Amino acid sequence: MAYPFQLGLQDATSPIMEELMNFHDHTLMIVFLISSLVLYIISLMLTTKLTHTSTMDAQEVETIWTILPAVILIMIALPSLRILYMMDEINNPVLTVKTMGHQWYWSYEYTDYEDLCFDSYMIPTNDLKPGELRLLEVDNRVVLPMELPIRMLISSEDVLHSWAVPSLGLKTDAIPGRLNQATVTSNRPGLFYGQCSEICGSNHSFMPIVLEMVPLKYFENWSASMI
Amino acid sequence: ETDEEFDARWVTYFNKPDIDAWELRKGMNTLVGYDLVPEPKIIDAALRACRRLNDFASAVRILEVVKDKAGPHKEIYPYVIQELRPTLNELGISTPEELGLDKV
Amino acid sequence: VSAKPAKTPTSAVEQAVGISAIVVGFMVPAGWVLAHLESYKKS
Amino acid sequence: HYEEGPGKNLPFSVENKWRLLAMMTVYFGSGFAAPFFIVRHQLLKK
Amino acid sequence: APSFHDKYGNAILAGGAIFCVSTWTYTATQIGIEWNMSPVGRVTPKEWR
Amino acid sequence: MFINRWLFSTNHKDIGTLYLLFGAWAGMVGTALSILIRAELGQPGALLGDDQIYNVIVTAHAFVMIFFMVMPMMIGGFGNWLVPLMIGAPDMAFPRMNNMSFWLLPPSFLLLLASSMVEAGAGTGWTVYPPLAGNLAHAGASVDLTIFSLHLAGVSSILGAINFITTIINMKPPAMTQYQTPLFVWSVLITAVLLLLSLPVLAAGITMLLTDRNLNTTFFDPAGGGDPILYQHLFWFFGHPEVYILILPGFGIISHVVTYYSGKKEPFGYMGMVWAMMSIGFLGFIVWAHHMFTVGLDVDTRAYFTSATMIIAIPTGVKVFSWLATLHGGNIKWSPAMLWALGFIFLFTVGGLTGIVLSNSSLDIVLHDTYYVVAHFHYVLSMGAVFAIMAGFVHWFPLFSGFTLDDTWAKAHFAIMFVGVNMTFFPQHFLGLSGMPRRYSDYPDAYTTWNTVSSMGSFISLTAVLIMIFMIWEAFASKREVMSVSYASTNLEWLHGCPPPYHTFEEPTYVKVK
Amino acid sequence: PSISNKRIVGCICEEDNCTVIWFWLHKGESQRCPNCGTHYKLVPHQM
Amino acid sequence: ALLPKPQMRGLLAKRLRVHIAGAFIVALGVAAAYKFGVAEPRKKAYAEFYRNYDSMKDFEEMRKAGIFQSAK
Amino acid sequence: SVVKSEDYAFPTYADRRDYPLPDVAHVTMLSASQKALKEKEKADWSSLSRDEKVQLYRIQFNESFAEMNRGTNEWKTVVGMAMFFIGFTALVLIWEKSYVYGPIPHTFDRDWVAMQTKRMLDMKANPIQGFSAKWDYDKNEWKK
Numbered sequence A: 001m002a003y004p005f006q007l008g009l010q011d012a013t014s015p016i017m018e019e020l021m022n023f024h025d026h027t028l029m030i031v032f033l034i035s036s037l038v039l040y041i042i043s044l045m046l047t048t049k050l051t052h053t054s055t056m057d058a059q060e061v062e063t064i065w066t067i068l069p070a071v072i073l074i075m076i077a078l079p080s081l082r083i084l085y086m087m088d089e090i091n092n093p094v095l096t097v098k099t100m101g102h103q104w105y106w107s108y109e110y111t112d113y114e115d116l117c118f119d120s121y122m123i124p125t126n127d128l129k130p131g132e133l134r135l136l137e138v139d140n141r142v143v144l145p146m147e148l149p150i151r152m153l154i155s156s157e158d159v160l161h162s163w164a165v166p167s168l169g170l171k172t173d174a175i176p177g178r179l180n181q182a183t184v185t186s187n188r189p190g191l192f193y194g195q196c197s198e199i200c201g202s203n204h205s206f207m208p209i210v211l212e213m214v215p216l217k218y219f220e221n222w223s224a225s226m227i
Numbered sequence B: 001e002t003d004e005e006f007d008a009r010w011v012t013y014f015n016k017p018d019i020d021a022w023e024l025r026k027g028m029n030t031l032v033g034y035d036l037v038p039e040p041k042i043i044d045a046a047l048r049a050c051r052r053l054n055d056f057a058s059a060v061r062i063l064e065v066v067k068d069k070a071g072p073h074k075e076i077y078p079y080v081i082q083e084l085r086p087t088l089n090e091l092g093i094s095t096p097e098e099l100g101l102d103k104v
Numbered sequence C: 001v002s003a004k005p006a007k008t009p010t011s012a013v014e015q016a017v018g019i020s021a022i023v024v025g026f027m028v029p030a031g032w033v034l035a036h037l038e039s040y041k042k043s
Numbered sequence D: 001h002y003e004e005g006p007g008k009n010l011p012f013s014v015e016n017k018w019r020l021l022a023m024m025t026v027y028f029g030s031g032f033a034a035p036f037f038i039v040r041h042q043l044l045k046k
Numbered sequence E: 001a002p003s004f005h006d007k008y009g010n011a012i013l014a015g016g017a018i019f020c021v022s023t024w025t026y027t028a029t030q031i032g033i034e035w036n037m038s039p040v041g042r043v044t045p046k047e048w049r
Numbered sequence F: 001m002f003i004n005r006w007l008f009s010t011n012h013k014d015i016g017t018l019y020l021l022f023g024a025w026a027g028m029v030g031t032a033l034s035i036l037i038r039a040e041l042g043q044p045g046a047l048l049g050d051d052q053i054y055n056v057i058v059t060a061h062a063f064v065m066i067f068f069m070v071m072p073m074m075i076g077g078f079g080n081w082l083v084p085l086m087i088g089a090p091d092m093a094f095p096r097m098n099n100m101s102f103w104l105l106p107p108s109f110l111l112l113l114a115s116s117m118v119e120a121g122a123g124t125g126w127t128v129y130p131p132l133a134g135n136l137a138h139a140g141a142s143v144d145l146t147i148f149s150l151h152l153a154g155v156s157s158i159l160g161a162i163n164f165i166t167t168i169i170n171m172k173p174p175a176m177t178q179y180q181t182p183l184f185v186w187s188v189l190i191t192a193v194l195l196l197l198s199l200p201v202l203a204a205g206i207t208m209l210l211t212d213r214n215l216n217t218t219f220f221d222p223a224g225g226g227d228p229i230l231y232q233h234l235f236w237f238f239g240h241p242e243v244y245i246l247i248l249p250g251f252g253i254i255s256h257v258v259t260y261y262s263g264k265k266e267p268f269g270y271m272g273m274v275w276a277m278m279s280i281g282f283l284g285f286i287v288w289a290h291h292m293f294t295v296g297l298d299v300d301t302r303a304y305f306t307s308a309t310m311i312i313a314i315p316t317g318v319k320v321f322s323w324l325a326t327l328h329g330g331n332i333k334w335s336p337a338m339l340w341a342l343g344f345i346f347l348f349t350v351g352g353l354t355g356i357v358l359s360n361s362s363l364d365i366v367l368h369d370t371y372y373v374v375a376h377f378h379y380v381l382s383m384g385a386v387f388a389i390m391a392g393f394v395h396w397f398p399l400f401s402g403f404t405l406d407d408t409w410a411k412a413h414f415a416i417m418f419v420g421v422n423m424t425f426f427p428q429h430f431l432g433l434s435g436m437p438r439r440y441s442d443y444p445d446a447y448t449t450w451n452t453v454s455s456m457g458s459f460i461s462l463t464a465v466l467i468m469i470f471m472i473w474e475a476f477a478s479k480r481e482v483m484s485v486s487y488a489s490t491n492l493e494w495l496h497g498c499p500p501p502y503h504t505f506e507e508p509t510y511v512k513v514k
Numbered sequence G: 001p002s003i004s005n006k007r008i009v010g011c012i013c014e015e016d017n018c019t020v021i022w023f024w025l026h027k028g029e030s031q032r033c034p035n036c037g038t039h040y041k042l043v044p045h046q047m
Numbered sequence H: 001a002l003l004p005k006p007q008m009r010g011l012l013a014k015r016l017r018v019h020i021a022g023a024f025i026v027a028l029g030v031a032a033a034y035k036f037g038v039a040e041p042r043k044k045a046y047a048e049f050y051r052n053y054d055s056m057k058d059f060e061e062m063r064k065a066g067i068f069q070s071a072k
Numbered sequence I: 001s002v003v004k005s006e007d008y009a010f011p012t013y014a015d016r017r018d019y020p021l022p023d024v025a026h027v028t029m030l031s032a033s034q035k036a037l038k039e040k041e042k043a044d045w046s047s048l049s050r051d052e053k054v055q056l057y058r059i060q061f062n063e064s065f066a067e068m069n070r071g072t073n074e075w076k077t078v079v080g081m082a083m084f085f086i087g088f089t090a091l092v093l094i095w096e097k098s099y100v101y102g103p104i105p106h107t108f109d110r111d112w113v114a115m116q117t118k119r120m121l122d123m124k125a126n127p128i129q130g131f132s133a134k135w136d137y138d139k140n141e142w143k144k
């Protein structure tokens, strides 16, 4: 989750947030290269005192100036497609979670076997326990097992929402009359904080998401205790 | 084209026997647009052309745009003046540096 | 674009008066309505 | 025919400096002060 | 001729520099803006229950 | 004498003048809304309370700055003042529809201001996505009034586009080709083409949304078999051509400004400029679903859309390198509009590369609906389009008014504006990377400091437009007219005087082909 | 020809050239294009 | 002695060629500066973290202070 | 004096180094002494002194290239005005912080942020590089 004076991304937990973070470093290096090229060329080419304001050969450098940005654009594009095709492969998941975003609260169904469902509302600011996080803590944290492929189906009852957790690299639209796939994994246990990204009314800032990732035996104990 | 037809065409254009002020202004206004410091016999032809149509001050700005057409490095203009000296004391034309037009 | 001399040239005091007028004419109503948001919230 | 020249092709008289200063500041200040009064209205309603 | 800029540019640099840094130091420090600085190495962690 | 000159006007200069006045007023409305938005986000807490009033302010800021400041001033004002002047036409082809388009604009503004005043308020974003903008979450007359505002603005821009295309194609001298026209005429042509090829799509979309709201049709709610992804398809099929409408006459303006104040008689690679503008216009219609990378499309569809986004990225690179190449070895005159143009070049380059970062669909899955997108689109809109507007205004204010601005106050205004908007929108990259999403009135504490920095930057930009008003007043506080203008042989609009008379080109231009 | 004392004259003075160059042409004897010098004369008597 | 003949043509062109060489070197240099400063240290930091990572002891030392709603 | 509205039609003397020989003389009409210099111009230039040269060059042209390329001092004034008005923005921000803004939420004092960043490294928030990787988990201090 976010810390003060943070510049870059949140640190990765899922594998895909590592590959997207490395690709972000790659494309930001490319952005720095092109921006420094443009800035150094304009600062060079304003400060001269020589002049040449007559007829110039119109087409003698255009082929280079069209092939080089194509080379850098495909240099961006091939890892983009390579990681683009690495989100919807064969998963063979473990658990299936169903998340419905009702009018300013999330709801979670674990009904693979022994149908379980609960609601996630925000702990209010005046009702916070000490040490807690403002605008991010929930009533019921969403408990998932460690390092396993978890199928996740996202929708909403009424309007558009967006189930998003940044540190796992998940952001998926919640559309009524739809059902959206997201596979979620992890590598470390702990608590991950996200919040809704689609505009959904007068309390749009006020639905958080807390994912609590635990070992599988403790997930089984939590599933037995919660039902 | 290459250097010799450019240079020969400009020195023959600036030694037109019936030249007036307008085409002299065209020549000395289009010559300073090139990525080029003008060759000293083009400047010799232009100074004699200014003398032929009986006009003084445009020759002094011809010398001035020779000086500031060079740019940063100042090994052009003393060399151009050191070649243009005999023209400069056969016509009576004065350098910009001695008239006080270079002291800002 | 070269220019005429100013037909009615402006003294520096009148430029200061004009910029003070623009600042006060912009920050009186917005400054007044942000001077009390809590009074609009049924104090 | 309509007036031709500098300062006459505009829909307001520029012939007085201070009158035009007052007109500019009330024009642009009304533009700046419209949404603040809108927000005041929405806060006064509910 | 001594124009406006030739001496008034030095005067306006001195005034603008000292005025801007003085009141920006004051609005950054003295008016109690909580900047929410990074807690690395500054605040000791306190035992929560 | 007044109502015949201005209210019943039938010549292009007066319509452009009223376009400039209306756009200046609407821009001041928009910057007031922006001051409100950065006022709530300055410190943690609820300055205004709920998120509904904040969303109303956000939607109003978006719609007022898009459809009422850049489009009228830029397209209408600069096109009506300059397009019959550069091509040598006496007037517009259909001046009555030009007048009707301008006079249709303030009804649309009044309908938007009424939309913000009804008891709900259209707090949905300028994307008016159902079912949030339905008659369930927004039961009231605010969304309908916003829809009719967009309808009136669309009819205005369609009429202007028809008038501009017929006056550019038809009212040339009979010996000139279309490839001998200035570059701003080309930008106005291509902008009008994309306007009348794009606006009926949103017209049909908001018509269907209005009939969903009030005629019990089920185009968009899934309870009757509808689908809101259809609305998103139609809206963005309009919406990215709308984006390139925002940016293209700015390209023409900066090409003219750099060519003038650089001392060049032509921009370098005029054919490359024309081809790149045609390519940007043609490829603006096939890249819309880069606004929809997290909605749940096919993986092959998003692969095509990020690829097509790279092919739309190349020819604007051709344009910016040709701007650099026409900067090469000229008599660089450091005018204020020169500083606005160079600021346009650098900051629009930065906004373009942030768009290229957003172009990849995977990093778009990470960075959808965050403030990284906000930093991207403000670095193109609020910096490139605004800097092109200010470059054109500073450059052609001697032509319009007849008086010359004080250059020292103008350069001070550029410096204040540059510092203010750069410190406004650079921490938003870090806010987007850290993960604080869009449309929020309150944020967690970890996003505090950048937000604080961003808020105070807005005030510096506010001071900029304040002294901008002083600039205009100072011109009319001075009443200094013009000797004459340099390089008036190549620029046709400068050769009739400053300001030009009411009747220009009564005796038309004389150009031959044989 | 013209009906007034002066007229805007635009020159394409070499072919396949982008920018026209424009200049006023007055009465009296012939003026000329500022870069190519093709001679232009004005006979203002038409209607 | 007297002055020699210096180069009179192609001045801005030769300035452009030496400084386009300088432009490519400085742009690749600042890109490599960002790369070797940020991207490679991040990659080796992730490699160091996950090469000898135990999840059971990590979870046990999170749950010894009572953060999870499932492990008490 | 004031001239008719066709001041745009006729060419005007414009001074720039891109146009070294302008088409219009700087001073159009001349006095009788200036006609004496103009009559002297048809003879040789050898009997021309310094002062006739300087004042006829000031008849035909207005500023030399040394005068027009001189370094004026407007950038100091421009950035000084910029820092004036940016200081006035600081005053406006001071006024808003004093009057417009209310209190901060209670999650910003020393004890709440102390327990919050104790918990934040307790659950190991981004412990690879960002925040909990800057804390030493053995000596119970920050990394030095």
Ligand code: HEA
Residues within 6 Å of the ligand: A034, A038, A068, A069, A070, A072, A073, F243, F244, F246, F247, F290, F291, F292, F293, F309, F312, F313, F316, F317, F318, F320, F348, F349, F351, F352, F353, F355, F356, F358, F359, F360, F364, F367, F368, F369, F370, F373, F376, F377, F380, F381, F385
């Ligand atoms: C001025 C208006 C403007 C302009 C020009 C652009 C231009 C671009 N926009 Fe943007 N955009 C918006 C206005 C604009 N946009 C708005 C208002 C939104 C918000 C919509 C919403 O609310 O959802 C938006 C949203 C938006 C998104 C949505 C992200 C999200 O929310 O999920 C994306 C992503 O694809 C995007 C991409 C682009 C791209 C790729 C360009 C390009 O056209 C940029 C041009 C590229 C350059 C100028 C690059 C410079 C190139 C060179 C210098 C050559 C060298 C290059 C290489 C070697 C590679 N835009």
Ligand code: HEA
Residues within 6 Å of the ligand: F020, F023, F024, F027, F031, F034, F035, F037, F038, F058, F059, F061, F062, F063, F065, F066, F070, F124, F125, F126, F127, F374, F378, F381, F382, F386, F389, F390, F393, F421, F424, F438, F439, F440, F441, F458, F461, F465, F468
């Ligand atoms: C033209 C488009 C435009 C322009 C200029 C701006 C300008 C600014 N914008 Fe805006 N903005 C948008 C379009 C624009 N924006 C859009 C489309 C959104 C998305 C809304 C949504 O989420 O749905 C948005 C969203 C948006 C948000 C998101 C709020 C949220 O979602 O939580 C914020 C807050 O930081 C913001 C801030 C600003 C600021 C601080 C400026 C400053 O730059 C203000 C300064 C601007 C000016 C001063 C105007 C320039 C005019 C002149 C200088 C005078 C002109 C007159 C003459 C020349 C005569 N903008």
Ligand code: CUA
Residues within 6 Å of the ligand: A101, A104, A160, A161, A162, A196, A197, A198, A199, A200, A201, A203, A204, A205, A207
């Ligand atoms: Cu749900 Cu925003």
Ligand SMILES: [Cu+2]
Residues within 6 Å of the ligand: F239, F240, F243, F287, F288, F290, F291
């Ligand atoms: Cu787009």
Ligand code: NA
Residues within 6 Å of the ligand: F040, F041, F043, F044, F045, F046, F047, F048, F441, F442
């Ligand atoms: Na707030």
Ligand SMILES: [Zn+2]
Residues within 6 Å of the ligand: G011, G012, G013, G014, G033, G034, G035, G036, G037, G038
């Ligand atoms: Zn010609």
